Amino acid sequence: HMTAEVLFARWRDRIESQLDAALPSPAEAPQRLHQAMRYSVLGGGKRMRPLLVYASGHLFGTQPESLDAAAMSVELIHAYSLVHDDLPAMDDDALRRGKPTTHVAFDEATAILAGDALQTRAFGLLADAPLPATLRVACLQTLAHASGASGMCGGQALDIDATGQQQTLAALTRMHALKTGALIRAAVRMGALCGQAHEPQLAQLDSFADALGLAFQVRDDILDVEADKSTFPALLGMDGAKAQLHELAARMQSILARYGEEADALRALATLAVERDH
Amino acid sequence: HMTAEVLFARWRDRIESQLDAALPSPAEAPQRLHQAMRYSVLGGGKRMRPLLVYASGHLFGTQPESLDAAAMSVELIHAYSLVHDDLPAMDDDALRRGKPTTHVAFDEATAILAGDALQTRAFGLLADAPLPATLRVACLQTLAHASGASGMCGGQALDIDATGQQQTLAALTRMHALKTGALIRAAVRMGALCGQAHEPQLAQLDSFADALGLAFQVRDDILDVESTFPALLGMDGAKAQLHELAARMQSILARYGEEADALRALATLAVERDH
Ligand SMILES: [Cl-]
Structure with missing residues (x-):
């Protein structure tokens, strides 16, 4: 069995190649839109959400070809949200991972539309996946619920509403649960759905993924x-x-304690969420 | 087309009620986002794209209940695109239909997010629809292809890139085919899919919808x-050019009986409307 470290490298390379092939070419018009879409998602990074899809599917022995669309879709939702978050009317960031943000590299209109189009491509890749229609529908329901006003978008809005105010612990936790927790849980759920997991195992993995999303933010x-x-x-x-972080770390490991080596990839994502230096 | 006008009024009232039931409550958290989402799609309007869904399904005797998800989804995509198009970085509009644009009634960040969330809701509604999964997937494929970089978004980008430039007739026609043509074709296609249309009818209706989208823009x-x-x-x-498109649209539907009258009336509307 390949170690978690080898799997993470393989899946990070895989998702880079898949996303490059899935996005329109910068030479096809409209070139600026396509260039900005690629600028906003290619070029490496932790790929935490794709890794969660693959690692969750890995629990069931699922082949990566069954997971690629789900893994790309969660990274595309994540990427689009950051393009919009960075805008001057939102968080107003000029740098992301040592490079100019998309609206600085291009312009605000291009960034707005690139974010819009990355969102559409996330759903399109799921709808076009080489999977049974019932599975594609279940993944699409999962991603939509986690990404919209009931998930990521709602959490972004809660954050904007709170600008200049001091949130309570209850409110801060709720905001993070929507703003980043929901899409992290979607990634784990989709990988397990592609693995043909049943509802009790989905609920168990959801408990793990719920703790992981909060742990990352703490x-x-x-x-x-x-x-x-x-x-x-x-x-x-x-x-x-x-x-708080120490308890979440212990909680995540306890949830997976009965699995064999097939859960080592998920276990290592939990450790990365708690222990990474960057 | 008076009987058609009655049908269209029924469908505009229906899609208003459907969208109202499908959107989050303005009393529930996050309140301001929900209020901006509702402001951006409720309150009437022509509802051209939901009407195309209902009318296309009507050709096959499909009842609106089987078409609501598809009809809502194309209006939600259309609605989100206008919220973003009105933003200062885009067309920079303070009014739409005599009322403040969403970013004026609220603010720019809320409008950005409201647009984002309406796009997601459009896909979630189709995915959750009370329809066979194979049909939901076909509609979701149709909507994604028509709404993204190869459709609506791409056409919007083409438009902005051409600001201040003189476009050829071919380029301008290509730009409109993506910017608004694609989603209009998607509306007709989804209605026909829900009507269990056969491939030749889909191709026929797509020719009609292609002409209709151009005529509407002209x-x-x-x-x-x-x-x-x-x-x-x-x-x-x-x-x-408008009159030539009108004759093409009526020619394409000419062999059908009264079940095509709803689509024929939408073709006439696209060409003759004073509003
Ligand atoms: Cl292995």
Whole structure:
């Protein structure tokens, strides 16, 4: 059995190649839109959401060809959300991962439309997947529920509404559950659906994915202090937030404790969510 | 087309009620996003694209209940595209239909997100529809292809890229075929799929829908004056092109019985409307 480290490298290379083939060429008109779409999603990175799709499918022995559309779709939703988030009317960021944000590299109109078109391509890839129609529909329902006003978009809105206000712990947790937790749970659910998981196992994996999405954000908050006025270290104290993260780490491992080596990839994504330095 | 007008009023009332039931409550969190989503699609309008879905299904005797998801989805895509198109970085409009645009009634960030969420809701409604999964997938494929970079979004980008430039007649026609032609064809296609249409009928209806989308744009350009088709062809040349499209649309549907009257009336509307 291949180690988690080897699997993550293989899946990161795989999703890079799949996304490159799935996006329109920069030489086809409209060239600026296509260039901006590619600029916004190609070029590496953690690929946490594709990795969750593959790692979840891996629990069931599912081949990557059955997972590629689901894995691309969650990265495309994630990528589009960041293109819009970076806009001057939103978070107003000029740099992302050491490179100019998409609206700086191009312009705001191009960034708006590139985000719009990446969202459509996420759904199109699922609808076009070489899978049974019932499975494509189940994946599409999952992604839509997690990405819209009941998930990612709603969480973005809760965040914008809270600009300049101090959120309570309850409200901060709820905001993160929508803004990033929902799409992280969708990634795990879709991988397991492609693995033909049944509902009890879907619910168990959802409990793991729920904890992982929060863990990632608590860790991020801790790192920000070590390197949206309300954060887990500000509301809990730094020691309290570290204890919160430590419990989520233990919780994630306990949920998967009965699996064999087939869960090592998911286990390692949990460790990365808790322990990464960047 | 008076009997058709009654049908269209029924369908405009129906799609208003359907969209109202499908959108989140303005009392529930996040309230401002939900309110902006509702502002951006409720409150009447022509409902051309839902009417095309219902009328295309009507050709096959399909009842509206089997068409609501598809009809809502094309209006939601259309609605989101206008919210983003009105933004200052795009067309920069303060009014639409005599009322403030969404980013004026709310703010730019809320409008961006409302557009994003309406797009998602369009896909979720089709995916959740009470229809065979194979039919839901075919409609979802149709909508995604027509709405993204190879359709509506691509046409919007072409339009912005040509700002201040003189376009050839071919380029302008290509731009409109993506910018609004694709989603109009999608509406007719989805109605026909829900009607269990056979491949020749789908191709026939797609020829009709292609002509209808162009005619609708040519008529909106003519009304706007009262690079565009009037600018390239003259006001008289634009009107001649409209009449040729009208005759093509009626020719394509000519062999059908009264079940095509709804589509025929939408063709007449696209050409003759004062609004
Ligand atoms: Cl292996």
